[PDB]
């Protein structure tokens, strides 16, 4: 039966990629949430860059 | 031999293709977004490393 | 003819059964390619949550000196 | 006769509606694949953003590595 045999062949490929999608729409949601901890990892680099500043200014005065 | 009823799973398959694609697309700005938000974090920490390497020159 | 729609049968049935080999050799690359990405991810992942404690911290005792 | 000539005219039109159909899912098969290789591509190129982007966190923790050296030799005063 060829058209059978076909068929298979098309819903091995449906099968593969109906999983794809579902891997894919996890991997979107894994990026928002790596997203939303890089966001708070720029902030927090912030905090380090002005703290750092602060303490090579307060360095540079104490040694005229 | 009836082949008319393939059209309709190459259709089904032809769907899950561009569905694939259109998600991959719609995920390009959350990396580009990591990415930038990483090379910011990165620039600001090698910024901070090298007033911190000064203060312990001075 | 129906000589030549057999033939154009014949030859749509060979290019149909090549072709759905590439597509199932692409659907397959995707899942590959899928997986590797979430070994990367889940490692990125970790390293970031690790790294924002770390900063952190340091931040702190540069606060003291 | 009628026979002959129903048969004729079925296996015609059975084979031209045959070769429109097969046509039609082959047309559906090529630009699946154009598409999924485009997709496939635009993946790997995805890939390559995180993986630099795994360096560059690597960066940072090099980094804060040689602060806390920094940090050791400021606070050794004496």
Same mark, same amino acid.
Not at chain 4, 55 to 62: I, P, R
């Given at each position: ?64 | ?58 | ?65 | ?9 079925? &296996? #015609?039109? +059975?084979? @031209? ?8 899912? !082959? ?21 390559? &953003? #995180?993986? +630099?982007? @795994? ?8 980094? !804060? ?14």
């Amino acid at each position: 039966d060829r058209v059978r045999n076909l068929q298979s062949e098309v819903e091995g490929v449906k099968n593969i990629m109906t999983q794809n999608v579902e891997r894919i729409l996890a991997r979107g949601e894994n990026l928002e949430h790596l997203r939303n901890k890089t966001e708070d990892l720029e902030a927090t680099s912030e905090h380090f860059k002005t703290t750092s500043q602060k303490v090579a200014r307060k360095f540079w005065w104490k040694n005229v | 031999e009836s082949w008319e009823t393939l059209e309709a799973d190459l259709i089904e398959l032809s769907q899950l293709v561009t569905d694939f694609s259109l998600l991959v697309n719609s995920q390009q700005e959350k990396i580009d977004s990591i990415a930038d938000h990483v090379n910011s974090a990165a620039v600001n920490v090698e910024e901070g490393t090298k007033n911190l390497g000064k203060a312990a020159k001075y | 003819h129906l000589r030549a729609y057999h033939q154009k049968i014949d030859s749509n049935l060979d290019e149909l059964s090549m072709g759905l080999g590439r597509l199932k050799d692409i659907a397959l690359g995707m899942q590959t390619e899928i997986e590797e990405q979430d070994d990367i991810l889940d490692r990125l992942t970790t390293k970031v949550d690790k790294l924002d404690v770390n900063i952190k911290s340091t931040e702190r005792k540069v606060r003291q000196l | 006769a009628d026979r002959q000539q129903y048969l004729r005219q079925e &296996v #015609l039109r +059975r084979a @031209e509606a045959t070769a429109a159909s097969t046509s039609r899912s !082959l047309a559906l098969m090529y630009e699946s694949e154009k598409v999924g290789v485009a997709s496939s591509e635009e993946l790997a190129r995805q890939r390559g &953003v #995180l993986e +630099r982007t @795994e360096k560059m966190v690597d960066k940072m923790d090099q980094d !804060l590595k040689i602060s806390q050296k920094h940090i050791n030799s400021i606070k050794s005063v004496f």
